[PDB]
Amino acid sequence: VLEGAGPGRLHGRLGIKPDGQPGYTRAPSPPTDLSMPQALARGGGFNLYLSDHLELDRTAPDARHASCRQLHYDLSTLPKASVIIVFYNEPFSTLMRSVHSVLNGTPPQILEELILVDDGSTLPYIREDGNQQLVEYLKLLPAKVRLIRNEVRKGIVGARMKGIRASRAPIFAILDSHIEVSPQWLEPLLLRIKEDSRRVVMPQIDGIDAETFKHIAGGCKLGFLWKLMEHSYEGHQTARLPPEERQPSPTDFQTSPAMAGGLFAANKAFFFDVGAYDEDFQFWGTENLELSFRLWQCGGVLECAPCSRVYHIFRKGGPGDSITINKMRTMLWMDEYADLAWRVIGKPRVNYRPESLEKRREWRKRKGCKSFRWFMENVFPEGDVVTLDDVPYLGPLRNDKIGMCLDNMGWASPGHAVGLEYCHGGDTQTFMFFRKVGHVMPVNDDEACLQPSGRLDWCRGTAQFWWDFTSSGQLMFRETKQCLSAFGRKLRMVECDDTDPYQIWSWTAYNPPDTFTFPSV
Ligand SMILES: O=c1ccn([C@@H]2O[C@H](COP(=O)(O)OP(=O)(O)O)[C@@H](O)[C@H]2O)c(=O)[nH]1
Numbered sequence: 001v002l003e004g005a006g007p008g009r010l011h012g013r014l015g016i017k018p019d020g021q022p023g024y025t026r027a028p029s030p031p032t033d034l035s036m037p038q039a040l041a042r043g044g045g046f047n048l049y050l051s052d053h054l055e056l057d058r059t060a061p062d063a064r065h066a067s068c069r070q071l072h073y074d075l076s077t078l079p080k081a082s083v084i085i086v087f088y089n090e091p092f093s094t095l096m097r098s099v100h101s102v103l104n105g106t107p108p109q110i111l112e113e114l115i116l117v118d119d120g121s122t123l124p125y126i127r128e129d130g131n132q133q134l135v136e137y138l139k140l141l142p143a144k145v146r147l148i149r150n151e152v153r154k155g156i157v158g159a160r161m162k163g164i165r166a167s168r169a170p171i172f173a174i175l176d177s178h179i180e181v182s183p184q185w186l187e188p189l190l191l192r193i194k195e196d197s198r199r200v201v202m203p204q205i206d207g208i209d210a211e212t213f214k215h216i217a218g219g220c221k222l223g224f225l226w227k228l229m230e231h232s233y234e235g236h237q238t239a240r241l242p243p244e245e246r247q248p249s250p251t252d253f254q255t256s257p258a259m260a261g262g263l264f265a266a267n268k269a270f271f272f273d274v275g276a277y278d279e280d281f282q283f284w285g286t287e288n289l290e291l292s293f294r295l296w297q298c299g300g301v302l303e304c305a306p307c308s309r310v311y312h313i314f315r316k317g318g319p320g321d322s323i324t325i326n327k328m329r330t331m332l333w334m335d336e337y338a339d340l341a342w343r344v345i346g347k348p349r350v351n352y353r354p355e356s357l358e359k360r361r362e363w364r365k366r367k368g369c370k371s372f373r374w375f376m377e378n379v380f381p382e383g384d385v386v387t388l389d390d391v392p393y394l395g396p397l398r399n400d401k402i403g404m405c406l407d408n409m410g411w412a413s414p415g416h417a418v419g420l421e422y423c424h425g426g427d428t429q430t431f432m433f434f435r436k437v438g439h440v441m442p443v444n445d446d447e448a449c450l451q452p453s454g455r456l457d458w459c460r461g462t463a464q465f466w467w468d469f470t471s472s473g474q475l476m477f478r479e480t481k482q483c484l485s486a487f488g489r490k491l492r493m494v495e496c497d498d499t500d501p502y503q504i505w506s507w508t509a510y511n512p513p514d515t516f517t518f519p520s521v
């Protein structure tokens, strides 16, 4: 039951005790002699001295465009929804604030429940063998709110699964454990899925500083890099969209090849029929790109909602064998393109659970999921590699005259010079070519682009990174029409003369198979 309800306290006044004083004892203002690096250290990314001093009913600004406030929903016609917050060792202030923001900002008749999932927390206030601070504080919240636990820590997929299974409503929404909503955040999501159950709709994300906690606005279309992480459409990538979509209205829903994180809503039935999540994914990793490829390919639709805004606390501080498994398993959905991605993350040989993954290959064909080439040709044709014929060359860039190859000289990360070293055949000495934008990059970072300076730097789809690889073997920078020379084991730009053997290179052609055979375990 809701006691004292009203605008901004849609579920009533939360956290009050029998005697009327609040059930949370807020903290004093952070000390004046307060070293920010130590505070983010002891807070796991946040300034917890401040969060503990801020109110759990903190009032946030409306990050929604003005046109979003001019819409009217009918809360009787909308399907109830289960919000699912999953947390591992989230502090009390941030966690309880996220919950307050949801209950205060979600009409109760469209919020079936609010499920808090303990993914094996090891803190006294969240542990069943300790303070019991969380358990006792929950008794001061609506009945909608129920806690459930994982015996041990199962990770992102494992805990969202425990949470989604427990839901009751037709629709479930997933929220982080360190967030604040803007008003009317859930109404747009319910309305969009009511009209088509196949749609997974995600809110657009604003920020909360992890040092000052100032609210900050934020950015819909998202692609992916061949290192297998989401990547917001670069400027030259929106320029390929149709004109009618290059600059979309701030109230319209627009699609997205990928989802950035795990803040989305979906119909529980459709979600379970479209594959749900790969429960052999380990801890935190590439689940976002494997749920995104699978959704689109198996008759789904992914779009963001500019009228559905949620604030998130991006951190400023703090396994490894897990992120490479999640990536190999994501390649199932990439078909022949998995060769390229496999090479970019370093030809990794791991135990990707080949048994369960073959039962995901069976499931994939039983549903008749569309190919990854379908994906690239119809969902992400703005990308730079829509077919593997767009990667004409992958291998060493060798200069026969001096008998040396290029070398990232250690790392592929942007911002450091390239060198000429004796050829040894390792990935450090392998480079790829993207022809749609003329990018000479190290195979291990498709965000790193060679420049006439001889230095790698961040890739931009522009003329300052465009290279032509001529048929004589030259690396001609398009804007100056000068060619690259290895003279004196130094890299300088010179006049183009196909008779100059110091500027003529050899680059391995890239003709991968039509099917990718996974690397043995
Ligand atoms: O084992 C885990 C890993 C993550 N999460 C939650 O999943 C969400 C996304 O993870 P997080 O934001 O911590 O990842 P990050 O971006 O910090 O690496 C957050 O609400 C986490 O608390 C969780 O409950 N258990």
Ligand SMILES: [Mn+2]
Residues within 6 Å of the ligand: 176, 178, 312, 313
């Ligand atoms: Mn987060």
